Design a protein around this ligand. Structure first.
Ligand code: AMP
Ligand code: AMP
Ligand code: MG
Ligand code: MG
Lengths: 418, 418
């Protein structure tokens, strides 16, 4: 039995970033860049107006002037020189004609006569409301770097730089199976004696889908050593990067996941000091030429299964996908109610957290409510839980208002407000 | 010109939740439930062992007993009665045979002889390590309610309850187009005079994809009133729920988005007191029978375009998708450097935030670094920005260490740690 901190260090040290691939612009969204991106031309590539108005010679000052050209885009005003005593109409983003050195916004002008004459109402300064060439992005500047995750603004920067095929780290492909003679499919209606619906598989498929990985659903496997070996061998040779099993890892006489992973590869650990999730097994299998496949023998209890996924599998998926910061967000928060910690193992207590203007202490902060009974068979304890409170193994009652560390397990930008 | 708080109230009051649909179990992930879900049978539906060990009559106490059956799943031990002086082998999740009232874990037992006899080493108590029928979920209990967002544990609860077709609120379908005679596709190589690559469209497509909505990409539209009217009429009749345009909303003589939205429907506002994002237009159009279509005339400047999407379009998508809490997460944080606020409009200053063990004041908390120059044409100011600092319109220099409100715009569970 090892502490969670050691089990995580072992998984981190074994897990390796996947080889990079080339994907299309929209396939790059959510992925980590595997190359730097440099601007092939400046932004703007021409001196551009910041305003709708008139391009002027700043030293002319207020007065009435003829409008000698109009510039909105492309070749508008090409070959025209704005000289002292003239002006040109411009729209925001329009190229500034040669000779003009400032822009006066349309609100500081007045059209005169029934042609093309305008009264400039202010004294402007050279460079006003003009974006010089390369103002926003210089030619050859690095706009994105290796190791940077691609979000909507990074997609915008790739499109600005004319990059439509991108080198990125791919997401791992994950195989998932359930084990047990007591399981039936979730489509089952009336249950026979000693049967339950398989809930872990669909839960894990959804959890892997939220991590943006492809899923290989290998179904229900019975408590038969030869049958489980065949499905594991088929998963290892299929090209997946991670295999997730659940169940078949306790102390029963038909629990074959641990001995099969010891036979096929290297089991680094099979027991972790934590509440819930004690029988977690982690192994590295080499596929026959070749490549490595990581295997997590997740506990069968629905709570322990999801908690082990959230703590151990999520950072592994991220490390394989090239994240330089794969750890989950940990924050400090105040308890809204008393919680008894466990005397033996540190507990990952499920909670519903929210940011409050007053966290109970007079300053704003996160607060947590327990999801109720924490029994590992009670999947209702995971319902709505956006965090796991890290309770040390003291056995004491942590009073309401005391502070604890919490791992945030669901989209902090999708948090329901107080 | 109206404040952002009013513009948001107007959008909220006009935006209506979409009609619910029936989807498959994995299509339900990320969606909001439009019906309550009740358990059709208890969990466990039979008295189940918590441990691998032996089912006993608690009052027998320590001693040597014959093993009369073995129970792991289904019909194992059906018709067998564990009487005083006997025991049954059980695995975790196995049905407890009739007559047995407690389980002694295998670590508190010893197999005796070369058949089927075991020594119970402890005095157990009635009910120990047994999950009674309905312990985790009672028959007919409500396990999920209308208005609840479906995550991995909620998928697990639907599978537990045997629900594979779910009534949910769908995501809106969003049409997106860019406007401008100066734009070229992002595939363009060498740019001609007065041209830039269209960056807003791919940025917005990515931003809508991150919100899990279907995208209708309507391409680049030129600064021609008849051409833009045709594309808007085609978008309105196509069945989309939201139309996003960018550009063509400033003070130029070829900016037709505002007058076209006034002609086609009801424009509620066209100017907002904010930095950046002043020319934001919002309208409601009725499609010819029928249904309503929401239109956002987003500003052309790349920064203003994305900031307006993050503040106004994200909560609208969420409201249409049935979220009861569509507002973004707002937190309080300390500045890592001084920032000058604007004297006229409240600014949405882009920042990179992280949670620190010491936020500078001695207590843990969020801290923020500015992304640098905030000019609305500088898309590099959005790069890596996971928050918008809400700076009031005071014109003062907010010193390093002072506290501000911040809107979190990117997955708080994907935050890079300190
Ligand atoms: N799709 C786009 N991508 C990048 N920049 C744009 C886009 N549309 C408009 N702009 C720029 O945003 C500014 C305002 O545009 P507009 O409101 O059309 O005058 C101008 O500098 C445009 O060149
Ligand atoms: N796929 C599954 N869905 C729901 N419960 C499960 C699943 N697999 C195992 N269990 C339960 O988890 C507990 C531990 O399983 P095991 O480790 O196989 O003994 C038992 O109560 C099982 O019935
Ligand atoms: Mg089992
Ligand atoms: Mg334009």
């Amino acid at each position: 039995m090892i502490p969670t901190e050691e089990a995580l260090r072992i998984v981190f040290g074994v897990s390796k970033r996947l080889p990079p691939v080339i994907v299309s612009l929209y396939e790059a969204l959510g992925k980590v860049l595997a190359e730097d991106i440099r601007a092939p031309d400046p932004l703007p590539p021409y001196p551009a107006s910041v305003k709708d108005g008139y391009a002027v010679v700043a030293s002319d000052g207020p007065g009435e002037y003829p409008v000698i050209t109009e510039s909105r885009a492309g070749n508008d005003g090409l070959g025209v020189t704005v000289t002292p005593g003239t002006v040109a109409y411009v729209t925001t983003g329009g190229p500034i004609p040669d000779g003009a050195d400032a822009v006066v916004q349309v609100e500081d002008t007045k059209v005169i006569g029934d042609s093309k004459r305008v009264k400039i109402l202010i004294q402007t300064k050279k460079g006003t409301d003009i974006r010089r060439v390369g103002c926003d992005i210089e030619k050859d500047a690095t706009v994105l770097t290796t190791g940077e995750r691609i979000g909507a603004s990074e997609i915008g920067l790739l499109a600005t730089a004319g990059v439509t095929m991108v080198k990125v780290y791919p997401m791992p492909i994950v195989a998932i199976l359930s084990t047990g003679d007591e399981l039936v499919e979730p489509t089952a209606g009336t249950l026979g004696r000693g049967q339950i619906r398989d809930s872990n598989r669909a839960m894990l498929v959804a959890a892997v889908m939220q991590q943006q990985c492809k899923v290989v659903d290998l179904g229900i496997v019975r408590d038969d050593r030869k049958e489980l070996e065949k499905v594991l061998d088929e998963a290892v040779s299929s090209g997946v990067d991670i295999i997730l099993t659940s169940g078949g890892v306790s102390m029963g006489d038909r629990d074959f996941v641990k001995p099969l992973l010891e036979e096929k590869g290297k089991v680094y650990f099979s027991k972790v000091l934590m509440k819930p999730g004690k029988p977690l097994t982690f192994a590295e299998i080499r596929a026959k030429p070749g490549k490595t496949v990581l295997a997590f023998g997740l506990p069968g209890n629905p709570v322990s299964c999801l908690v082990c996924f959230n703590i151990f599998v999520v950072p592994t998926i991220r490390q394989l996908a090239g994240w330089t910061s794969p750890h989950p967000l940990r924050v400090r928060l105040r308890l809204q109610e008393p919680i008894k910690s466990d005397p033996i193992a540190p507990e990952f207590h499920r909670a519903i957290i929210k940011w409050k203007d007053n966290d109970g202490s007079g300053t704003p902060g996160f607060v947590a409510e327990s999801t109720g009974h924490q029994m590992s068979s009670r999947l209702l304890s995971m319902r709505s839980a956006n965090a796991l409170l890290e309770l040390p193994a003291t056995g004491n009652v942590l009073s309401a208002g005391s502070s604890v560390s919490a791992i945030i397990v669901s989209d902090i930008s999708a948090f329901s407000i107080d």
